[PDB]
Amino acid sequence: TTAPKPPSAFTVEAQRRVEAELPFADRADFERADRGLIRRPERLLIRNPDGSVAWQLGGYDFLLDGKPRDSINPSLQRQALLNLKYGLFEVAEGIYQVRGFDLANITFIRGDSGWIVVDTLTTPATARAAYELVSRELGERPIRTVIYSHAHADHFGGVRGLVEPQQVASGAVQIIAPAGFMEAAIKENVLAGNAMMRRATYQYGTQLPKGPQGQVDMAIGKGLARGPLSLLAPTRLIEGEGEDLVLDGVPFTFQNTPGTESPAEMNIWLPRQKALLMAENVVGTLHNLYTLRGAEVRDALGWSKYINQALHRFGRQAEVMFAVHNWPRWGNAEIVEVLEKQRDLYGYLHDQTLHLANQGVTIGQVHNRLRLPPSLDQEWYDRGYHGSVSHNARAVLNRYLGYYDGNPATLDPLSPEDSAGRYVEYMGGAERLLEQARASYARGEYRWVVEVVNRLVFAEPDNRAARELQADALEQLGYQAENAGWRNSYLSAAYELRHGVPRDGSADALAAMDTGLLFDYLGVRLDAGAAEGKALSINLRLPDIGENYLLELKNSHLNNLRGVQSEDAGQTVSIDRADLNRLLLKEVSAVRLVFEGKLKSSGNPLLLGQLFGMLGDFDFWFDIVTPAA
Amino acid sequence: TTAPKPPSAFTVEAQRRVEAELPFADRADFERADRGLIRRPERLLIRNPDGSVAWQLGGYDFLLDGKPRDSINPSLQRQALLNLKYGLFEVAEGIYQVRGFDLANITFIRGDSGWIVVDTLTTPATARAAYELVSRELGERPIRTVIYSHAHADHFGGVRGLVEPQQVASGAVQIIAPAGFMEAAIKENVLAGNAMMRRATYQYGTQLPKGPQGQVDMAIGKGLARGPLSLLAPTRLIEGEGEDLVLDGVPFTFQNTPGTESPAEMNIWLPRQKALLMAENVVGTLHNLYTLRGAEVRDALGWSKYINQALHRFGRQAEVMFAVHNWPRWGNAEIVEVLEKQRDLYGYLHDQTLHLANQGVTIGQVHNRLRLPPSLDQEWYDRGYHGSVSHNARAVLNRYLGYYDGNPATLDPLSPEDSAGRYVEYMGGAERLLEQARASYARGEYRWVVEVVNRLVFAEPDNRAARELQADALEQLGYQAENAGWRNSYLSAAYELRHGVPRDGSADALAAMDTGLLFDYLGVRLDAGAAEGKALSINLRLPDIGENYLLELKNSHLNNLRGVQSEDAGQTVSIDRADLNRLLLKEVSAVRLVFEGKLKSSGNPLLLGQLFGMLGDFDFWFDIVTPAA
Numbered sequence A, B: 001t002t003a004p005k006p007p008s009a010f011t012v013e014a015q016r017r018v019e020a021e022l023p024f025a026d027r028a029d030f031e032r033a034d035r036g037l038i039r040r041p042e043r044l045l046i047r048n049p050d051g052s053v054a055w056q057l058g059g060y061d062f063l064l065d066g067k068p069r070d071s072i073n074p075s076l077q078r079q080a081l082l083n084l085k086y087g088l089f090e091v092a093e094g095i096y097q098v099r100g101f102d103l104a105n106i107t108f109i110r111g112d113s114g115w116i117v118v119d120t121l122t123t124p125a126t127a128r129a130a131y132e133l134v135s136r137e138l139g140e141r142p143i144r145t146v147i148y149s150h151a152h153a154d155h156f157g158g159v160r161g162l163v164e165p166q167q168v169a170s171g172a173v174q175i176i177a178p179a180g181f182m183e184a185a186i187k188e189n190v191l192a193g194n195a196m197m198r199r200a201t202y203q204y205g206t207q208l209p210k211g212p213q214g215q216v217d218m219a220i221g222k223g224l225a226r227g228p229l230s231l232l233a234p235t236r237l238i239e240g241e242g243e244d245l246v247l248d249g250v251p252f253t254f255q256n257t258p259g260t261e262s263p264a265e266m267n268i269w270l271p272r273q274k275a276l277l278m279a280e281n282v283v284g285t286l287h288n289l290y291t292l293r294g295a296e297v298r299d300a301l302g303w304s305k306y307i308n309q310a311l312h313r314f315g316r317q318a319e320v321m322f323a324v325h326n327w328p329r330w331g332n333a334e335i336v337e338v339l340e341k342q343r344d345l346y347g348y349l350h351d352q353t354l355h356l357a358n359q360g361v362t363i364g365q366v367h368n369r370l371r372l373p374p375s376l377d378q379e380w381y382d383r384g385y386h387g388s389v390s391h392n393a394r395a396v397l398n399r400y401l402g403y404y405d406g407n408p409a410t411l412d413p414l415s416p417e418d419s420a421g422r423y424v425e426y427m428g429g430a431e432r433l434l435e436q437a438r439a440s441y442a443r444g445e446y447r448w449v450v451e452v453v454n455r456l457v458f459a460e461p462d463n464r465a466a467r468e469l470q471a472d473a474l475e476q477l478g479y480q481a482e483n484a485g486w487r488n489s490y491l492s493a494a495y496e497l498r499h500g501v502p503r504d505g506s507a508d509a510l511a512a513m514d515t516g517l518l519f520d521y522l523g524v525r526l527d528a529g530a531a532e533g534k535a536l537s538i539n540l541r542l543p544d545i546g547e548n549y550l551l552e553l554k555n556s557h558l559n560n561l562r563g564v565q566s567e568d569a570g571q572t573v574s575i576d577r578a579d580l581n582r583l584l585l586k587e588v589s590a591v592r593l594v595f596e597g598k599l600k601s602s603g604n605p606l607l608l609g610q611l612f613g614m615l616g617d618f619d620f621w622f623d624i625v626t627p628a629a
């Protein structure tokens, strides 16, 4: 059968264990998540211009009764219900947030003559919906300043729903961001982007229903709104360690925290309200040092130290602390404790992973050895909803020591699909493997079962009995998972094994991409077969941005060098970056650009075309839980 | 049996394949490695002050006949013999190197009144031995300037064998280094240092004999000299993109290449000789993006681009190119080709790994899919002696996507020792596993055998038959390995499985360590059991360096904050950094320091002691190829 199964007796026992181990009697977050509520609109439905649905919360109604469901980790279900506390909220005098209109919060700070807005959600429709809620309840006021707390799409993505380029060009609207914003906003999502995006369908459970045996929450929010990604460049950057500014009468201190949750990030202190906005450094969950979709590993040490810096600068005077995800904390003592514990949470994960590692504990072992001490374990905002202790400890270890466990048995490993046949033969064949796996399954050993049955799936990807048992065990692991990404991953893997994989660009984002990175990405697109034995060089001049690049294709590799031209280039191309962007977005033809006097050439006029024709594409729905089709 | 076996028929066939695939007819390196030879001292033996042996080459005599040995990859044996071309060499007029006195080269550039020296080898005795060779052959001249090409111990480690602090303090001797030198010199070897050091015994094959069935070479040199590590701080730093200086009459251009082979590194162009010293950016081998001992992953993209920058700045005029490992290349056309190919080598590894990854190829697969194109494959300096294509492709992938293959079967893996019993049971028990493994072994399937028998070793680490078969298969893989680190690793793993693991600090290095890092490392040493439930804070003042730190132990985590003091610290300690260093090196007692007026306290005088008593140690010889003892 290819539908979700009930929680097994072992999964039920594991949920009961969670209830026995975690302080469910501490219900204060429920009072925190409702504090200062102005308006929870009855039934949220946000639509995009093209008529698609950006966001809705109706699929979560199953959670509203608060009745325990054994196909959901009870700690996750707690978080799931808390993230359902949406609407417009007062945080402190003249400080409001709209929560639950998207993954992140949007923050409205009352200036003398209009709003200062922190962050803008993921897509313009949710930002616009949020601003309309604000206007209906608090009165319409112009937005004078948008601040990006950090360079993530769930923060800058909805900006055009709030402001238009004309307002920025006139100086009617300022956009403030931490230094390094533009570099970080685009960079990490590019070179490995297709891999990340596809792996992200698992993390986000994009093919799962909302329900008790599908997607229930995304830890830092319910989920990510769907729609166009927008991005408007900052007009002012917060440099160095930070800056004090006054915006529309309101004093702001920005504290840069480069290289924590994002390469470009800053906390915001508001001395008049004694309000401390901890960007995404401190949220209602342990965050990712490594996000499973795939990314660079984050620096827990810097993260801890920047939280400590904020603690000693502001925490020591804060009356309310709030963030760009989840709900605020009020009370200086509570704030001081949350700051210390989150500081020590990242500090501990970092230091104790390395302590274990220096004892010889490997990347393959550390998650089964490292445990938070009670003082850190027993806080809800320390729980592994978004990041997990498990995968973060492996991440620290990977950061310092890399992927290889130091055991040469694993140094030159056969691909899973090339060793799988022999695993299966050594275990007595598929039928025998399944027999033994089913007995294991019957003992609740799902972490083992998914390991060993995965071998048979990789040996025999059409073996329907193997896929369905693998799926069953993964699903129990999903039910069991406190971590929303782990849950979604497990259930998505079960979905694809049971059903198969599906068989049916942002202009702003491209505009924000550095030219060197763009050509780095084209070099990633290069088909090595097509490039072999070729050599060509092209001077590229982009006059609107006053940049020249030398492009050199040689030895099946595309090079680009900023600020260099070669007298020996076969071709020299002059084209505005804006027009190159249109070209790569298919919004204009190369021929038309030439006719408009927008794409110019000397030398061999064919080389750039030849280079473009060597560029391959990537299919999105690549296989994950079986070998390639 | 517990001694090395002959190469098997399959290993013999694999060596013959190497000979068929690689351009052994291209012997020019042999003429390159001998070019400009002034003196090869007959029998090199370098001794440390304490009477230990720093370095000798006599153990390599087996290689001198040049006779093929089937227990050595023939491509590696070629490299092994070339790295034996030691002694004093002329590179170009007034430019000399001593090669083969240590892992790296030391370079002597004739100034008007003395030497400018680039790098200093690993330990003072080898540097001193090298300088004596130079003085005997070329005449003694004072060293006026030492330049560190980059922040690695095989480059700065032998500095006290050349110069003394007094000469630096008087301005008699300048030390020039790339900006970021001091930060990088110590940093990466610290927090994960014990793990790295122990894993390094495998990479370096420190327990292997020199011989055909042990250690034969270390790719970028024969091996690493043994002895005290010294480090003297630079007196002048090369800032920004680089600088042009004149040293003792000789013009130098330094080209910073931060974040390639090292975070702090620079190439050196010598316009008078048209000599281009490519630091360790370009050496006679593919280098590591990830060094198996364990380290941060290096940036192949920046590495490629910095090589391209050097190509277009200098390569275009160079007459000789040489490096801090291996031998020079002469001839502008040859230099241009080596620069392009090395640029495209790192570029290709980077771009094609990501191309494959964006197609869904995982970290567990990519090394079995990615292959260099012939133009890059067929050069000796592109061969995987030091880095390997295999482990570097996985490294690129790990850098962008992390350790996790995206398949949730592998998301929450049991430790090898916790799943091993079940692998063994599913395969019919130890005796049955061994039977099937031996049949596989007999078919030459060593990469499979080491995978599956490793399971039995982890289930039954005292199973002598399992250990010996595992060892046998690993050893054949070692014989087969072109990569010196892979070879050494495989043979070391075979050594420890057959024999077991052994059952029986640098003042300069500690001095060079930032105070924050030092306390970061103490926090790594913290025993979490001892720390639990404790809280203490200490203001630490270090007046010789004019630095204050706030130390806070809470929630089983030690925090330190630079430039902060707390009115609520339980204790305030004032101590010179120099004296703290002595204390941690056990060169002085805390009591004596107090008596000398060197360690001062107010508040609770017990806290610092309490904090120190919570600090654990790490045993060096942890298990790698079996579960912990």
Ligand SMILES: [Zn+2]
Pocket: A150, A152, A261, A262, A280
């Ligand atoms: Zn973020």
Ligand SMILES: [Zn+2]
Pocket: A104, A152, A154, A155, A280, A324, A325
């Ligand atoms: Zn966010």
Ligand SMILES: [Zn+2]
Pocket: B150, B152, B261, B262, B280
């Ligand atoms: Zn180096």
Ligand SMILES: [Zn+2]
Pocket: B104, B152, B154, B155, B280, B324, B325
């Ligand atoms: Zn080196």
